[PDB]
Amino acid sequence: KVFGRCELAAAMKRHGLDNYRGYSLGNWVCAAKFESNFNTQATNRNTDGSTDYGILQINSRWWCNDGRTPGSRNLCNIPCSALLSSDITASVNCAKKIVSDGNGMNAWVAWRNRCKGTDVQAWIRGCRL
Ligand SMILES: [Cl-]
């Protein structure tokens, strides 16, 4: 499913991302826009053979199992396909684990290059939250 901007903001707020580990909601909506264009079914393969899955492009080397990434950990204990669902619960729950790992939202390269240090409140402007 492809979310609208405010629809995703509301869903993320309901699942407890607003100010999670100090990251306001706009940071999570900006990261989803530039990682997946708000598409839950986005996938992208990387040079190392791992693949990134879903609205927040979560990687199979560390976080989920896709059966084709040798030596990967599956820290979120989920098949990577669960991250492609129209229900974003599994992606949010795994993202909370990733943002707690020590480097905060710098784990998402699009957030660091396209959202960090910008006016991220713009991503939630106008929305009924
Ligand atoms: Cl980037």
Side-chain angles (χ1 to χ4, degrees):
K1 165 185 163 157
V2 182
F3 277 84
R5 173 179 65 85
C6 293
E7 182 190 16
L8 179 67
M12 286 179 153
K13 187 178 167 158
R14 183 170 67 100
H15 278 100
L17 281 181
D18 189 15
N19 295 313
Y20 192 82
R21 284 281 173 141
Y23 293 95
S24 64
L25 192 63
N27 283 287
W28 298 101
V29 176
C30 183
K33 172 67 180 167
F34 294 120
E35 287 290 357
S36 68
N37 207 19
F38 300 143
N39 183 3
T40 67
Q41 299 192 67
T43 59
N44 284 111
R45 188 113 112 120
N46 303 117
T47 66
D48 66 4
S50 66
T51 297
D52 296 331
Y53 295 86
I55 208 152
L56 289 161
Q57 293 288 280
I58 286 172
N59 191 81
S60 66
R61 186 163 296 302
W62 306 98
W63 304 102
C64 65
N65 179 46
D66 64 8
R68 69 167 195 196
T69 309
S72 73
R73 321 290 321 281
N74 174 12
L75 289 167
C76 290
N77 197 41
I78 44 167
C80 299
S81 64
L83 301 173
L84 309 176
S85 176
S86 52
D87 179 340
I88 65 168
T89 299
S91 281
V92 168
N93 282 356
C94 187
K96 286 179 176 174
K97 190 175 311 260
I98 292 170
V99 81
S100 301
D101 206 39
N103 299 325
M105 284 196 78
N106 290 302
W108 286 276
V109 65
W111 178 85
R112 180 168 81 243
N113 288 332
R114 304 182 71 177
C115 302
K116 187 182 189 173
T118 72
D119 177 24
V120 294
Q121 190 282 147
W123 290 99
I124 60 160
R125 178 160 311 144
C127 299
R128 194 152 45 214
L129 298 174

